[PDB]
Amino acid sequence: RVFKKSSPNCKLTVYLGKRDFVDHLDKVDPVDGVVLVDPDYLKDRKVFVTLTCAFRYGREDLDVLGLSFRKDLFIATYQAFPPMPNPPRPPTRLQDRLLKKLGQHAHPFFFTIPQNLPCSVTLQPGPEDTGKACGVDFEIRAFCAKSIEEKSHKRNSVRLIIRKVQFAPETPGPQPSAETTRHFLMSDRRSLHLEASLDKELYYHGEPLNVNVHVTNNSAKTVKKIRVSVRQYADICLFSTAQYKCPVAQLEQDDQVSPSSTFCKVYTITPLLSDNREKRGLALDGQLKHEDTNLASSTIVKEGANKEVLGILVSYRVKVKLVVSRGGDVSVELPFVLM
Amino acid sequence: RVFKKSSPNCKLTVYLGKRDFVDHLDKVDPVDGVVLVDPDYLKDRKVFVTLTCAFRYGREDLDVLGLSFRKDLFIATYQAFPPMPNPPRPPTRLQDRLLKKLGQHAHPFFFTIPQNLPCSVTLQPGPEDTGKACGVDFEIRAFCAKSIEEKSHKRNSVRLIIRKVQFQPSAETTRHFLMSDRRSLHLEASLDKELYYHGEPLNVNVHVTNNSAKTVKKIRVSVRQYADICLFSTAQYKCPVAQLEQDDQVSPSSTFCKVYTITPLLSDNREKRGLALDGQLKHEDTNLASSTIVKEGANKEVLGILVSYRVKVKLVVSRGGDVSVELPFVLMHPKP
């Protein structure tokens, strides 16, 4: 399915296939479109088209005045018109359709992406206000300024939101599990052997959240409950990395544990996007201006680089919260990934 | 600061805190005050207090001289003297200041406002029409008549005027024609906020979005005040409080953009016809009327002046046709 942004201008009218381009591992998904241009105003006016990898963390004229702007992590720059002696050498077969349907003046463009660019990812806004945004995005502008490509302005620009994505590899890590001890002032016996065994390491959207929690018990200090809680970690490296704790979901049953034996329950959870809608501070995958997204995929930080990756670094950890008389809330975290 | 009103017979003397009462909408600003009366004239004479939510559309004696009179939206009445059971359960801190200040003959009083009451708004008089007026208002009279509370007469009645003032919408539309078939005017009058008040002006980020032929002449943006009047006929009176503009022209086959900055000032539309003002406190300088609204529509229609505001974004295109578009947005006061 194909869609266009026809600039009201009817000078640059850009035809594109998909808004979400699949950022694969070995390659990316290139952009593959055309730009229909009209001849009677574009007399020695020259068509260009660009891909802006933009990063956002605030207000569009407040953060302007000051000493800083958005650190645009990348910009690709193409010249459509005037054409070389046949510029488009690997023509896309989408832009076969977009040339045979359209006119002789329809102009190709493709846009390859490199291997250092993150996804289109945002946070979740709050229900309450002081004026804030954040998030990465990928966008495409086609324009015509009198001066060379190194300058541009209003009055020709055609903009469209596209999207880019992390997509985790073939292999899960080890099957991550959990079994800790706990020592106190008042009860001596090891009192909490707690085996939170699991099955998988890199889930996606549309799978269960089961955690096989095996209590091994020989003690006093009557335990009350085991709450299970899907922590989202909203890492944000702007002027500093910060994590912003908020549970996307939580379940719990009243399954109580006797002294001196081994008991075990699988605690079983759904975080849905629809449950945490109109809620604060839960990173969501960066959506296409109004469209429904999913809960933000975990982002991972490459093993080692010269520059630290700035911005939101989504992590997800399933906390296993406990209640023991008269109510002490003991728990632990693990590493697990939603990419 | 406190303000009083003593009748020229020194009998009923009212003390009050604020002339402007902050009309919240889950609640409303209640009245707080006291009435100092003298008892040797008032020997077996019975003090009261009331609050009149009133609607005016003309002359006192002449629309008095009518098949109708004021259709008051509201009137609250309460027993000051005798105190029938000295019945204020909560005494107010303003009454806590006045009862300590005055002689304890100060009778407290308090006025609850219901949810169906419209705000204080007056149509602006003409410069040439001398005896023409129209406005909603709220007042307070502490008064007495020998008859039981059902009636009164003008004497012993102590006036006072107060106010019940009510304390990211994008537009984008296409324009198709006869002799120029192109989309020819997409236009986005984008903004940042919706509800302003006195002090913060009107930037309108209008994004020109236009194709080729039919040279555009100009763009100009006019804050336009709506005055909806419902007495026997609903009626809307269009008049430009402020309009600002430049000569920033757009080209065929381009996408221009201008922020146009307008600011309706009370001082500029002084001495003019047709601009709803907020009610004054009988002579004092006021503001441009705050936008009123009908909350969700009470079972009974709101009989009053119903102020709304808009930015009418107008264009002229060759050879000067006055294309335009309009939106919703509201002007109301800031609370302390």
Partner: peptide, 12 residues
């Protein structure tokens, strides 16, 4: 500084 927007285009 460095630029702004229009604000909405939901399909074709």
């Amino acid at each position: 500084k460095y630029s702004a927007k229009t604000g909405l285009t939901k399909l074709i």
